């Protein structure tokens, strides 16, 4: 799945179909992406057997479930409220979860794709999400260091800041996982906004 | 290699391109560890590394 934003109003979408074949759909509207485009890094669209629909596929990932698809179950995949009819550009499941993500971003002081924005405000949003990532990387090691409070902290502390951050992240709680999932989807949103506002 | 990296990203899927944007700090300015990136994608450090390698190989040829 590759969405190319051609200008503020127009995109094309290239998706796998079957065998070695991909299909490119032109005249893809940028206006409504929130209603169709999955923000989750654990999913992407493929072209449906008959070419009318874009259908979700779960990638191999430890990220949380979204859109009511835990893994690839064609009851849900083929179902109308879980896919996007091409040219209609509406996927209720995707829209529903996207909207939670949007509200979260609004709560963090980030600009959102459903309200007005321009290049400057998106750029400021990337500034702010970078700040969130950094603070987060501080908290992750803080929490790991408590756990895991053994006097062998000296061993951990024999590493560089990066190796420490890496080991803490590797070993972290599911809660932390949820924070990074959320932030990844918000990042995807801000990027769609950046591209539309170029 | 801002333009060349961009031409490469154009040949990747949304997911792979965003792995690399995160990694190289193309949007927020901050480069990220393979572990931060892997956490954002729910994949291992190694898978992120393979994506990065794929991109470097594409970056070399045309």
Curated annotation (Swiss-Prot), chain B:
Q: Which residues bind DNA?
A: 34-53
Kindly list the places in or outside the cell where this protein is found, as annotated in its UniProt entry.
Answer: Cytoplasm
* Ranges where the record places region Sigma-70 factor domain-4: 8-61
Which top-rank group of organisms is this from?
Answer: Bacteria
- Give the protein's biological function: Sigma factors are initiation factors that promote the attachment of RNA polymerase to specific initiation sites and are then released. This sigma factor is the primary sigma factor during exponential growth.
* Record-stated family: Belongs to the sigma-70 factor family. RpoD/SigA subfamily.
- Domain comment, as recorded: Contains 4 domains, connected by flexible linkers. In the active conformation, the domains are in an extended conformation, each making extensive interactions with the RNA polymerase catalytic core. In the autoinhibited state, sigma-70 factor domain-1 packs closely together with sigma-70 factor domains-2 and -4, contrary to the extended conformation that is seen when the protein is part of the RNA polymerase holoenzyme.
Subunit info here reads: Interacts transiently with the RNA polymerase catalytic core formed by RpoA, RpoB, RpoC and RpoZ (2 alpha, 1 beta, 1 beta' and 1 omega subunit) to form the RNA polymerase holoenzyme that can initiate transcription. Interacts (via sigma-70 factor domain 4) with the phage G1 protein gp67; this inhibits rRNA synthesis. Interaction with phage G1 protein gp67 does not inhibit transcription in general, but selectively inhibits transcription from promoters that require interaction of the RNA polymerase alpha subunit with DNA sequences upstream of the -35 promoter element.
Q: What is this protein called?
A: RNA polymerase sigma factor SigA
Organism, as annotated: Staphylococcus aureus (strain NCTC 8325 / PS 47)
From the entire protein, which fragment is shown?
Answer: 296 to 357 of 368
């Amino acid at each position: 799945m590759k969405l190319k934003i051609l200008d503020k109003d127009n995109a094309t979408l290239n998706v796998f179909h079957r065998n070695k074949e991909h299909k490119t759909i032109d005249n893809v509207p940028t206006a409504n992406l929130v209603d169709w485009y999955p923000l989750s890094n654990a999913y992407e669209y493929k072209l449906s057997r008959n070419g009318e629909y874009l259908e979700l596929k779960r990638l191999r990932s430890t990220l949380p479930s979204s859109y009511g698809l835990d893994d690839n179950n064609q009851d849900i995949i083929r179902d109308n409220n879980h896919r996007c009819k091409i040219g209609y550009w509406y996927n209720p499941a995707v829209r529903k979860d996207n909207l939670k993500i949007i509200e979260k971003a609004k709560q963090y002081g980030l600009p959102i794709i459903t309200e007005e924005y321009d290049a400057n405000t998106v750029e400021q949003g990337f500034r702010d999400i970078g700040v969130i990532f950094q603070s987060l990387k501080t908290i992750v090691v803080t929490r790991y260091l408590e756990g895991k409070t053994e006097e062998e902290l000296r061993i951990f502390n024999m590493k560089s800041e990066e190796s420490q951050l890496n080991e803490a992240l590797k070993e972290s709680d599911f809660s932390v996982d949820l924070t990074y999932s959320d932030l990844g989807q918000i990042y995807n949103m801000l990027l769609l906004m950046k591209k539309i506002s170029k | 290699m801002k333009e060349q990296l961009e031409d490469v990203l154009d040949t990747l899927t949304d997911r792979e391109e965003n792995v690399l944007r995160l990694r190289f700090g193309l949007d927020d300015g901050r480069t990220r560890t393979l572990e931060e990136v892997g956490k954002v994608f729910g994949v291992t450090r190694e898978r992120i590394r393979q994506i990065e390698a794929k991109a470097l190989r594409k970056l070399r040829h045309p």
